[PDB]
Ligand binder design. Structure first.
Ligand SMILES: O=C(/C=C/c1cccs1)Nc1ncccn1
Ligand SMILES: [Zn+2]
Length: 573
């Protein structure tokens, strides 16, 4: 069957809610009375960019564990750092959580706790566990041993001197960088994540949610653990990148006599052949190598969604990988295989011709009409998706590569002189007659070999000409880079772009019944017995189908009724 990842490995061996290891075990009664034996997790994306595919593991681990155990999961924006904070990041994050079929129990912000965090900075100062430093960034490197660690004169300032200076920082007394608030931890400890970390930095800038009220803003080292305690996070799950930071994490809570959440780290998801440098990908969008942050060639969530990948395929893929402390190293070919096997089960089959050539069946009359009924998914579940009718007549389209004017060879099974080809779901074959040159285009004349039972070597797809839908653009996508390590290219990652990563076909046609797939979309066909049957909302990305001999496609963001634009999700293979 399908073994869930939440009952195995890293997630299946986590503690029960309410049994988080505490230095002071009496801080659980106020914690237990809030959780009521429910799991409480968080998702804390920083809203200064788009989510890539790695965040889908962060989303699945945190919302999925909360949902698997009938608990709750916060959607917490980590707007600790005040900047321009463009609203599209906040929306895109919300949409990508909702798109993956997870509903947050409550949407919160890190800025929501600036008041409570300022009170705990005083308590830490009053506890002689912090101090204000006026050191330059070069000075603290020497005090950290850029070597032998030495203390600073500020560390021995009286408690009342720290209180006096911090109230000055609050009221915009000093400039950016000239004054900090460092935790008084331990300099003999070998962990560099404990060499008097900065807890508050003076910024004197407006925050998009709080404005000019705050002139000093805390750091990540101060914010993560304390906001987890405020929201009674039973399991605070993050990537193994911050495993050394768990000492300072647990330190700050034990230094303030607050509930100490359990930070357990999992290995992040690393796809081979992916660059994660936000600046590098920014360079691509600006110079035009891709047509937006949601370009179907990117491994950002918006781009993967626009490529046409169904959300359930992503989750089904992360689940089969599992979650351990070991960081992965998965080839993108295994990701495309998962999406391919998912669409094989959940999409209807349509007839599309990418490089059409007009066919004239000479021996058929103009009034001739043979209705051919075709199921949307031939197989064990035919009657579930329904049937459709195509009218076979004198004028049809087939693919240029399915007809050749010279006799065939051992590798060519399609239309040729002396070698008839079968038309899908059509009783009898068509035989080659001649090729007419007309209006620049080529027109193949055939006979319909009616009444003669002869097995063809293959059956090709075809479109009725009179009711064919003409597609403005079909975009065939491949890997954006030629190699699996673009940053290691001797001439730079820009010199490793795949020029053929996007091919735009201008003359494709598809059968009329695509209009029927749009009307039934969002279709949301389910994989029996699978736990990853996510229902989607309306949108061109949900209009998915398989072109019977070409691959899987969907409607792009830019598609309209009088201007269809298709994306090739993944090859047929
Ligand atoms: O999509 C990204 C990276 C996306 C990011 C979003 C926000 C910060 S990085 N990288 C990629 N690399 C190789 C091939 C395709 N895609
Ligand atoms: Zn100092």
């Amino acid at each position: 069957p399908e073994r869930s990842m939440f009952s195995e490995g890293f997630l299946g061996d986590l503690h029960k809610p309410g049994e988080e290891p505490q230095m002071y075990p009496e801080l659980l009664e106020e914690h237990k009375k809030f959780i009521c034996d429910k799991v409480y997790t968080r998702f804390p994306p920083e809203p200064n960019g788009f989510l890539h595919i790695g965040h889908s593991k962060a989303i699945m681990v945190n919302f999925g564990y909360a949902q698997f155990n009938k608990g709750n999961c916060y959607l917490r924006f980590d707007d600790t750092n005040p900047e321009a904070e463009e609203e599209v990041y906040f929306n895109s994050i919300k949409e990508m959580v909702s798109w993956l079929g997870y509903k947050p129990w409550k949407i919160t912000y890190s800025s929501d706790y600036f008041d409570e965090l300022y009170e705990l900075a005083i308590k830490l100062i009053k506890s002689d566990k912090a101090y204000i430093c006026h050191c330059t960034p070069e000075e603290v490197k020497a005090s950290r041993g850029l070597g032998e660690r030495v203390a600073c004169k500020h560390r021995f300032q009286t408690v009342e001197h720290n209180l006096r200076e911090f109230e000055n920082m609050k009221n915009g007394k000093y400039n950016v960088g000239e004054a900090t608030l460092r935790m008084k931890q331990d300099l003999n400890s070998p962990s560099p994540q404990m060499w008097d970390l900065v807890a508050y930095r003076v910024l004197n800038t407006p925050h998009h949610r709080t404005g000019d009220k705050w002139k000093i803003y805390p750091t990540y080292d101060f914010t993560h653990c304390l906001v987890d305690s405020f929201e009674n996070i039973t399991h605070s799950l993050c990537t193994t990148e911050f495993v050394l930071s768990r000492e300072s994490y647990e330190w700050l809570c034990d230094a303030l006599h607050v509930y100490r959440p359990a930070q357990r780290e999992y290995g992040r998801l690393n796809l081979t052949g992916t660059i994660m440098s936000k600046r590098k990908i920014a360079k691509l969008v600006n110079e035009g190598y891709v047509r937006g942050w949601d370009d179907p060639r990117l491994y950002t969530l918006e781009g993967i969604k626009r490529r046409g990948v169904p959300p359930g395929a992503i989750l089904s893929f992360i689940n089969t990988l599992g979650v351990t402390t070991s960081t992965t190293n998965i080839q993108t070919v295994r990701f495309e295989s998962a999406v391919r096997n998912y669409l094989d089960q959940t999409t209807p089959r349509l007839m599309m011709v990418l490089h059409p050539i007009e066919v004239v069946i000479d021996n058929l009359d103009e009034s001739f009409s043979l209705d051919v009924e075709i199921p949307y998914k031939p197989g064990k579940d035919e009657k579930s998706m329904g049937y459709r009718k195509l009218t076979f007549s004198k004028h049809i389209y087939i693919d240029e590569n399915d007809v050749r004017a010279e006799p065939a060879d051992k590798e060519f099974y399609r239309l040729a002189p002396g070698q008839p080809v079968g038309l899908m779901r059509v009783p009898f074959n068509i035989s080659f007659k001649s090729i007419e040159e007309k209006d620049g285009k080529k027109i193949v004349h055939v006979n319909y070999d009616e009444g003669v039972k002869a097995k063809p070597k293959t059956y090709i797809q075809w479109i009725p000409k009179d009711t064919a839908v003409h597609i403005k653009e079909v975009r065939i996508y491949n890997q954006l880079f030629k190699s699996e390590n673009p940053s290691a290219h001797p001439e730079g990652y820009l010199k490793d772009i795949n020029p053929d990563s996007e091919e735009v076909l201008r003359n494709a046609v598809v059968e009329e019944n695509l209009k029927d797939i749009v009307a039934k979309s969002p279709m949301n066909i389910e994989i029996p017995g699978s736990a990853f049957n996510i229902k989607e909302n309306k949108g061109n990305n949900t209009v998915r189908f398989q072109a019977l001999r070409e691959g899987y496609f969907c409607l792009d963001k830019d598609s309209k009724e009088d201007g269809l634009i298709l994306n090739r999700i993944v090859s047929l293979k």
